Amino acid sequence: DPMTCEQAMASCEHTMCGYCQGPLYMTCIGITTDPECGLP
């Protein structure tokens, strides 16, 4: 399991949302795919 569900979010890599599932999938999505993903 390289990287965690967090790490998928933390990386901004919606593609690797696979670590997260269900609510956490769509949550990691909603962060990673956010236009302002770590955008100041």
Side-chain angles (χ1 to χ4, degrees):
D1 302 55
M3 105 201 301
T4 71
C5 167
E6 206 70 46
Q7 300 323 291
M9 315 193 185
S11 54
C12 202
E13 299 301 287
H14 103 68
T15 58
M16 251 70 275
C17 259
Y19 286 95
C20 301
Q21 64 294 91
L24 277 177
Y25 183 8
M26 270 55 212
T27 277
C28 69
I29 289 294
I31 277 154
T32 55
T33 68
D34 193 82
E36 302 193 312
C37 190
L39 206 170

